[PDB]
Amino acid sequence: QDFYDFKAVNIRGKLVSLEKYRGSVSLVVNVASECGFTDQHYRALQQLQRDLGPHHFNVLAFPCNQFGQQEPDSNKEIESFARRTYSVSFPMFSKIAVTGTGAHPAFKYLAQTSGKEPTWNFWKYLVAPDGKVVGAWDPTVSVEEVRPQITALVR
Ligand SMILES: [Cl-]
Numbered sequence: 001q002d003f004y005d006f007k008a009v010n011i012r013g014k015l016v017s018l019e020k021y022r023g024s025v026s027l028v029v030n031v032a033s034e035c036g037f038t039d040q041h042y043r044a045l046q047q048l049q050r051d052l053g054p055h056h057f058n059v060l061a062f063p064c065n066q067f068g069q070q071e072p073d074s075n076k077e078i079e080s081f082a083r084r085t086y087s088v089s090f091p092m093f094s095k096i097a098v099t100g101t102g103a104h105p106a107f108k109y110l111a112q113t114s115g116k117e118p119t120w121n122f123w124k125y126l127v128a129p130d131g132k133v134v135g136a137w138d139p140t141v142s143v144e145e146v147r148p149q150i151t152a153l154v155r
Contacts, residue, residue, distance in 0.1 A: 001109065002109075002130060002131030002132055003018060003026070003028070003106060003109055003110065003127045003131040003132070003133065004018045004019055004021055004022040004127075004130075004131035005018070005019070005131065006018045006104075006105055006106035006109065008062070008093045008094070008096070008104065008106060009093065009094040010091065010092070010093050010094065011063075011075050011078065011079045011092040011093055011094055012075075012079065013075070013094065018060075018106065018131075021058065021060070022129070022130075022131060023056065023129050024056045024057060024058065024129060025052075025055075025056065025057045025058075025126070025127065025128060025129060025150060025153045025154050026057070026058055026059075026060050026126075026127040027045075027048065027057070027058070027059045027060070027124055027125070027126055027127075027146070027150060028060045028062070028106075028110060028124070028125040028126075028127055029041075029045060029059060029060070029061050029062070029122060029123065029124050029125075030062050030063075030064040030067075030098045030107075030118050030121060030122065030123050031061045031062065031063050031064065031071070031078075031082075031092075031121065031122065032063065032064065032065070032067065032068075032070035032071040032121035032122070033063075033070065033071050033073060033078060033081055033082075034068075034070040034071070034072070035067075035068070035070040035121045035122065035139075037121060037122045037139045038070075038121075041122045041139065041143075042082065042085070042086040042088065043086060044142075044143035045059045045061070045088075045090065045143065046059075046086050046087060046088055046089065046090065047143070048143055048146075048147060048150070049088075049089055049090040050089075051147075052147070052150055052151065052154060053089070053090070055151075055154040055155065056129075056154060056155070057150060057154050058090055058091055059090035059091070060090070060091050060093065061082070061088075061090060061091065061092045061093065062092075062093045062095075062096050062098065062104070062107075063075070063078050063092070063093070063094070063095040063096070064095065064096060064097065064098050064118075064121070065095060066097055066098065066099060066100075067118075067119075067120045067121045068120075068121070070121055071095060071121075075094050075095055078092070078095070079092055098117070098118045098123070099111070099117050099118055099119075103117075109133075110125045110127075110133050110136070113132070113133050114133045114135075114136045116136045119138065120138065120139055121139060122138075122139035123136070123137070123138055123139060124136065124137045124138075124139075124141075124146060126146075126149060126150060126153070128153055129153070134149075134153070135149055
């Protein structure tokens with residue numbers, strides 16, 4: 001088992017296999033819309049996608065309402081917000097839990113194998129081409145500090 005064995009409903013309601021990302025590097029991020037981190041993070045994540053997307057990399061953004069309830073809106077609203085405000089071009093998924101008993105199994109996998117579970121919005125896991133977690137950061141770590149770790153993995 002690895003991260004790319006899991007399935008998730010995308011933000012438009014279409015079920016997808018994360019197998020479609022195998023061979024690629026992924027930055028798996030739990031997102032929120034009303035957070036203090038929201039604007040800086042969405043801007044940095046989109047720039048990350050712009051710069052490293054062409055090197056077989058994606059941000060995989062999963063909305064989550066668990067942390068301060070800063071993602072209360074519908075999947076439709078969240079997508080509209082991300083696309084119109086930040087010109088987001090990375091994959092976005094339907095709102096999920098990332099922690100607790102009801103967490104998405106893919107997020108159970110990332111927490112169990114990394115030893116860290118998300119404790120706020122905008123936690124970030126780096127997944128290697130083979131679907132294994134090689135890094136995890138909390139939202140206070142800048143995308144300037146995360147990015148070089150991603151470029152190390154891409155070709
Ligand atoms: Cl770099």
